[PDB]
């Protein structure tokens, strides 16, 4: 399990995380992938967390896309990615509450 990722997703760590989730309510919304279809999330806190995560992602995307080699295609691709992120964020701002 060299290079840290393996360590992170080693069974023991996972178990610990699960335990934390069970007792006290420590989740790491960084750690899990954000769900595709909203309205399968009855809790508000979770939703908020997800929204926050997406915002963070968007910010990250923004930070990188103004790099100096602007003509490279990665940046262009991200522009679409950025849009997608924005859309997701908007969706997360649903009007149930």
């Amino acid at each position: 399990m060299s290079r840290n990722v393996d360590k992170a997703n080693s069974v023991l760590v996972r178990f610990q995380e699960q335990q934390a989730e069970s007792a006290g309510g420590y989740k790491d919304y960084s750690r899990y992938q954000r769900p595709r279809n909203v309205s399968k999330v009855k809790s508000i806190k979770e939703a908020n967390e997800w929204k926050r995560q997406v915002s963070k992602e968007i910010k990250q995307k923004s930070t990188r896309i103004y790099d100096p080699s602007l003509n490279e295609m990665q940046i262009a691709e991200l522009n679409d990615e950025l849009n997608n992120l924005f859309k997701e964020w908007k969706r997360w701002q649903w009007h149930i509450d």
Binding site: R3, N9, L12, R14
Partner: protein, 114 residues
Amino acid sequence: SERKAINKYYPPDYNPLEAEKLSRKMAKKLKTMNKSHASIRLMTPFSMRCLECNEYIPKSRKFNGKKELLKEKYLDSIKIYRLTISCPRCANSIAFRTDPGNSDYVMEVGGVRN
């Protein structure tokens, strides 16, 4: 606390099978582990030119690549891999495949061998 550590501490209630099951349940949800292009450190055997900016990355030069499994295996039961690299100057994704018929590699829309 020391790299050759014999026994990692477990909680007093740790049903190992149960724990494993739990992990599995929370592996589909997991971000890492449920993805492709897992990282790797590799030297470059081909000694090739980055097709965008013509940067002549020579033999044995070290990179933090991404190894990914190619679903279409060679013959039957011997896997082949895509091994992504970036050129030093321009950030173009070079990669290569390991077709073991010739005991060597194949370039994959990254650069050219010379």
